[PDB]
Amino acid sequence: TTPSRLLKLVLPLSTVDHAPLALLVHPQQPLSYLERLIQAELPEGEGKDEGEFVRWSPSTEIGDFIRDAARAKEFEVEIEGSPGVIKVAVPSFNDRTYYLRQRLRRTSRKISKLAAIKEECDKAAHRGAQRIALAGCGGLIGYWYIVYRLTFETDLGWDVMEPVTYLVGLSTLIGGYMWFLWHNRLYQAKGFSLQDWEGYLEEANAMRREIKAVASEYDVDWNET
Template sequence: MVVMVVMVDGGWWMVDASCAPFKLERSFKFLSVEAGTRLQYHRKFARSFTSSFRRTKDLIKEESARKTNKGDEHVHEEQVKAGIQEATKQQIKRPWQREGADKPPVEQSHRSMNKNMAKGKLLTTPTRLLKLILPLPVDATHDEEGNKGEFRSLAQNENIQPLALLVHPQQPLSYLERLIQAELPAVHDSDGHEKMPSIHFLAEGSERDEEGERKDKTDSNIASYSGLGHEGEDTPAEHQDWVRWSSSTEIGDFIRDAARGREFVVRVDGMHAEMRVDVPSFNDRTYYMRLRLRRMSRNIEKLSKIKKECDILAHRGAHRIAQAGFAALSGWWATVYYVTFHTEAGWDLVEPVTYLAGLTTIMGGYLWFLFISRDLSYQAALKITVSRRQNVLYEAQGFEPQKWEALVHDTNALRREVRIIAEEYDVDWNETEDLGGEEVKEVLEKENDKRKRRESVSDGDAAEADSESQRKGESKDDKTEDKKE
């Protein structure tokens, strides 16, 4: 047997040259010795080399496994980030935003958000828009396990945040249908083709009265009505007759008709899911309107007191001016009487003086009314004096007539809007309670009557101006025709 001595890991080793399967990294010398004399050393060194080689191999395997795990974790993190970014981009493209769009739906803080929301809600806003909150059964991006794509399931999902949509009462139900479809995944028909799920809106029928009993045949053409909405009593399940509404119906009309019951249903075909939504009552629908009406009524009450005081003072000043004029005329009469009958001048001197004085007064008054372009009446003169005095007092008290007129106009418009909704809901609205008393109501009605009179007068003036311009145009046409002839 021939053995060889090699240097491995800084030491010299004696191994069998016929079974050396490794490459030598540095030069070494072959030494030949007798096999019998070195056999025991050969076996000892061979066992040590084998154990060292196995330890090195195990270390290499552990290091490669660690690197593989780190690479897999990095790839998984990149995939999660890419999914979140894609979902965020899709939500930014839509006109509505979900809170927490940058967080996965399976996060623990979001897991309990939709647990207690069994029904949707239809809320009013400070504007004319309505806020519809729907507990979606499924999500377009993930399922309840966080899967997406072909791994997504269409099971009931309690971990998805409720969806909020802003709609206008005058928009059709088809618009709301498209908004809901944009948040739902596609479904497959019987042929395996993908399609968007159909959305249907159902409300309780009108074949029963307010107590849920079926009407008589004589009343079959009269629809029952109650504006209580979710504030009303529950209709027994055996008395509920659901009616599907056309998608071309306005949302406001659908809600008003659905107010006879406590809720309406949004049914999603293809997923065997339906969402029940509480119907807002008259109090819910007009909450922000009546809140604004109370705030505006308080401002009107405060400003009306200032205006009333200024108007009283202005009218008193006008009456004082009229009384002073009567006193001046009385003094003039007394002077003429005294000069005529108790002095040597007599009537020969007083007559031309009184004649000229009276004629001068008439001419001065005529020129004054001609300058102001008003009617020759006591009311016109009184109105001018009152208006001037009012403007002075308003400026002193910080009262702005333009702001007052705008406030009264907006309040009356809001009153009309609430009154229209009350008529649609068939509810008796206590207007005095929201206005804060009969005084504010009288002020609003009085100002409304004044505005109507001004508009009628302005319309009459405009009609007169139009007729006058038409007459002028006809006269011009006649003149041109005469010239041509």
């Protein structure tokens, strides 16, 4: 095919061969802008055909029109007082998603490592908590057995044991108070920001929303893989 349409990072690029010519356009504009440019090129009439080649309205939106050009996979131009009836290619779905899909992929790559780092750190802290917790539980159960034996295996009795209990509880309060003070007195080595991870995820969400929107616009059931 002699002419073509290349996509660009925001807005389509149309290469037409009548030393060819190139145009930029924004999607939400109409075809009349394009007619005006093509007319100011040549030294008047012009028409656009899609589907089976019926003429569409010049006051129509482009982004609502390339989709039909794609379901037929072509685009047709007609000029009054001249030869030629020009076929032109069209971007597919993948073509529209390119330069966008790739950026999502890069962001996912950058997310994976940081997720592994979070995994490591969380597991470390969890093992610490679990072990010290089980130690404290063993301590309490030891106290339980001690009190039971001292109660029901001696002549000492509760009349000697009760103050021991009061004093031990107060000692526990003191120790807890000191631990709290000391604590008032994390991701360092594989260091990162939770907000960096959050912002990358925030970007990825909206990128997926845009992609699924375009997918629904063509109805071609997009797969993330």
